[PDB]
Amino acid sequence: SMEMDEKDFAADSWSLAVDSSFLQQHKKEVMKQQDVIYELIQTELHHVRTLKIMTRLFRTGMLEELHLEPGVVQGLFPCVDELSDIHTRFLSQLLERRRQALCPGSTRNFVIHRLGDLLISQFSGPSAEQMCKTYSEFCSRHSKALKLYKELYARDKRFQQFIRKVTRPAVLKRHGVQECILLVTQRITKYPLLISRILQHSHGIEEERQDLTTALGLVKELLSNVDEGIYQLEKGARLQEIYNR
Amino acid sequence: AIRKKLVIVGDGACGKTCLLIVFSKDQFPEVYVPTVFENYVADIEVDGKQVELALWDTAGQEDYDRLRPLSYPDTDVILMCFSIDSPDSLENIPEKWTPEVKHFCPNVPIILVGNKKDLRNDEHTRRELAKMKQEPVKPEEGRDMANRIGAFGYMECSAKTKDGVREVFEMATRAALQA
Numbered sequence: 346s347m348e349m350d351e352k353d354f355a356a357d358s359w360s361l362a363v364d365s366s367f368l369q370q371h372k373k374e375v376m377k378q379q380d381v382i383y384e385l386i387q388t389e390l391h392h393v394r395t396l397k398i399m400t401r402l403f404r405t406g407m408l409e410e411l412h413l414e415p416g417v418v419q420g421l422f423p424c425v426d427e428l429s430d431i432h433t434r435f436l437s438q439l440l441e442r443r444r445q446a447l448c449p450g451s452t453r454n455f456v457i458h459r460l461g462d463l464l465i466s467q468f469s470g471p472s473a474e475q476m477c478k479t480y481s482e483f484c485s486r487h488s489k490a491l492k493l494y495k496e497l498y499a500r501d502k503r504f505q506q507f508i509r510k511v512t513r514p515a516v517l518k519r520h521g522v523q524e525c526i527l528l529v530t531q532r533i534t535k536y537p538l539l540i541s542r543i544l545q546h547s548h549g550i551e552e553e554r555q556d557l558t559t560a561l562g563l564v565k566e567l568l569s570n571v572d573e574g575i576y577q578l579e580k581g582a583r584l585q586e587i588y589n590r
Numbered sequence: 591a592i593r594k595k596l597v598i599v600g601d602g603a604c605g606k607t608c609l610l611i612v613f614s615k616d617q618f619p620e621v622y623v624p625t626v627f628e629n630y631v632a633d634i635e636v637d638g639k640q641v642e643l644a645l646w647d648t649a650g651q652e653d654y655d656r657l658r659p660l661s662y663p664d665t666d667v668i669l670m671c672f673s674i675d676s677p678d679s680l681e682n683i684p685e686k687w688t689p690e691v692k693h694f695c696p697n698v699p700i701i702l703v704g705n706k707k708d709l710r711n712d713e714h715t716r717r718e719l720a721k722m723k724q725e726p727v728k729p730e731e732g733r734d735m736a737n738r739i740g741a742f743g744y745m746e747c748s749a750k751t752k753d754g755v756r757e758v759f760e761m762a763t764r765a766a767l768q769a
């Protein structure tokens with residue numbers, strides 16, 4: 346992540362991020378709504394960061410330092426550039442909505458009142474079709490990626506040295522190769538939990554309650570479509586095992 | 591330090607997310623209780639052995655039967671949770687969660703955990719449950735279900751007060767170290 350965004354999202358909550366004199370100006374219900382919106386953006390910032398570790402630290406480091414067989418790096422990190430594109434664009438929209446809401450003279454005091462429309466746009470039309478296509482491919486290649494990583498770590502000396510070198514710093518504690526793959530697979534199913542809790546504290550404006558209700562339905566439709574399009578690929582599986590599924 | 595993987599399973603109302611959060615911070619959040627848990631690697635020393643225990647939650651995956659099994663590969667210990675304020679969560683353990691965990695995690699120890707033990711003697715909980723001809727899960731009902739499903743053990747805890755939380759994760763570490 347970039348320092349500007351890390352500092353803006355360093356506090357455990359929105360109520361601790363904004364100045365205490367600004368906090369005192371809002372109703373309890375608004376503080377509750379804002380704390381959950383802050384959690385959605387803060388976890389989106391961390392998810393984009395997980396994708397950057399996978400693309401820049403792992404994938405590009407293996408291409409530039411190791412001599413793996415062709416198609417090995419793609420097998421380890423399937424769809425990482427497409428995933429990074431989807432989520433960096435979504436994070437950009439979330440951060441621009443926060444930026445526009447900043448009070449003049451402040452880089453931390455803001456209130457987001459219109460999240461619903463942004464969530465409807467992300468989870469409808471072409472962006473939803475690309476999220477569905479990318480996660481259906483990624484999640485179907487998840488088991489194959491873990492198995493390929495385990496094989497390389499156990500048989501390749503230079504690969505093992507590479508992994509131990511780039512994962513040694515404490516900031517990489519939770520972000521080993523397999524950990525990154527599961528963090529990404531689990532991201533999509535965190536959205537209904539966050540959205541429903543935001544909706545719980547968004548009854549003040551009827552149009553916002555309606556927009557978030559629509560967004561929740563769109564997220565669940567995307568999840569059901571991805572779940573129904575998954576079939577784990579396996580290295581070595583024969584056609585007979587596949588058509589006898 | 592050896593690396594071990596822990597996954598928590600159970601119904602949405604079982605309090606699994608809150609349990610992982612309270613353990614990872616060694617604190618019940620004073621200002622904001624997070625809605626979700628990403629992952630965490632806990633440094634634990636149990637009976638003289640140092641372990642890095644990776645923690646994973648399955649919350650949000652309950653209705654997605656093809657996404658949910660992707661959390662299971664190379665799991666070393668399962669925490670199977672139910673809520674003591676919800677006898678309905680305990681009934682879902684033997685023929686929904688247990689056969690799924692035995693299929694995707696063969697031979698992995700399972701610790702059956704009764705969460706929200708602080709609600710067992712809560713008057714509001716007792717009044718609400720009595721309307722559906724129910725009462726908080728008794729300690730012997732928890733032990734009998736754990737025995738029945740072939741669990742490694744049965745434990746109780748309260749994320750609210752922190753009582754029993756540390757014990758659950760130290761025992762899960764011991765279970766993950768066994769042959």
Ligand SMILES: CC(=O)Nc1ccncc1C
Binds near residue numbers: 491594
């Ligand atoms: C330590 C840990 O959590 N590793 C992991 C993550 C996801 N899938 C498989 C594994 C082995």
